[PDB]
């Protein structure tokens, strides 16, 4: 996936 | 035919550990449409900020920002199962839009880039040269942040294992496995990428038996 922070 | 339009860096997203993640690659002929799939980082994550990126560094924070932005109402889930489709579109204007889409939720927030942002014709050969320069430190940056990545999710992973296997977990083997994690928790405070595998070795070692359950 990979991911983001808010 | 005599000439193109070419994207002269690549266009991205910070992604989790402060790493550029590319969307568009460089020397890309507009028009031009990629899209790609991200998740939330943590448990009932409400947000993802999107932050727009310029540059063939592979620290975020090496790369020229272009933008960034929320999207919120992200229905509570587990981490890393929400679907965020992001999208870069530059037209044959040389506009950029970045839109990012909830899935589920069936939100999306955009942001438009005029064609004149960013990074002029000298800056980006000083950015290209840089990207060689520092091709090592980068390389390097890149792993550190895969292992830090590794060692989250085996964190995480682990600790909702030891509470689906509850009582199944002998006391001792509770322990071990509970004082690896806090050891490996520190660690991902830190830049040591040893260090971390070493935890992570560590934890292998004792949860041999939280495996087996697991496994049911």
Do not use: C, T
């Given at each position: 996936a990979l991911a983001l922070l808010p | 035919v005599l000439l193109l339009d070419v994207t002269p860096l690549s266009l991205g997203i910070e992604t989790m550990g402060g790493v550029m993640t590319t969307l568009i690659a460089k020397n890309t002929t507009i028009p031009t449409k990629h899209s790609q799939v991200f998740s939330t980082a943590?448990?009932?994550?409400?947000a993802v900020t999107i932050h727009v990126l310029q540059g063939?560094?592979?620290?975020?924070?090496?790369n020229k920002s272009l933008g960034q932005f929320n999207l919120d109402?992200?229905?509570?889930?587990?981490?890393?199962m929400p679907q965020i489709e992001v999208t870069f579109d530059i037209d044959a204007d040389g506009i950029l839009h970045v839109s990012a889409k909830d899935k589920n939720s069936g939100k999306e927030q955009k942001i438009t880039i005029k064609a004149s942002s960013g990074l002029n014709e000298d800056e980006i050969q000083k950015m290209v040269r840089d990207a060689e320069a520092n091709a090592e430190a980068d390389r390097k940056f890149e792993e550190l942040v895969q292992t830090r990545n590794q060692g989250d999710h085996l964190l995480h992973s682990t600790r909702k294992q030891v509470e689906e296997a509850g009582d199944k977990l002998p006391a001792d083997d509770k322990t071990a496995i509970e004082s690896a994690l806090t050891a490996l928790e520190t660690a991902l405070k830190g830049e040591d990428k040893a260090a971390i595998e070493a935890k992570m070795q560590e934890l292998a070692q004792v949860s041999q038996k939280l495996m087996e359950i697991a496994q049911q």
């Open positions: - | 943590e448990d009932n994550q409400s063939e560094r592979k620290r975020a924070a090496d109402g992200i229905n509570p889930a587990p981490r890393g």
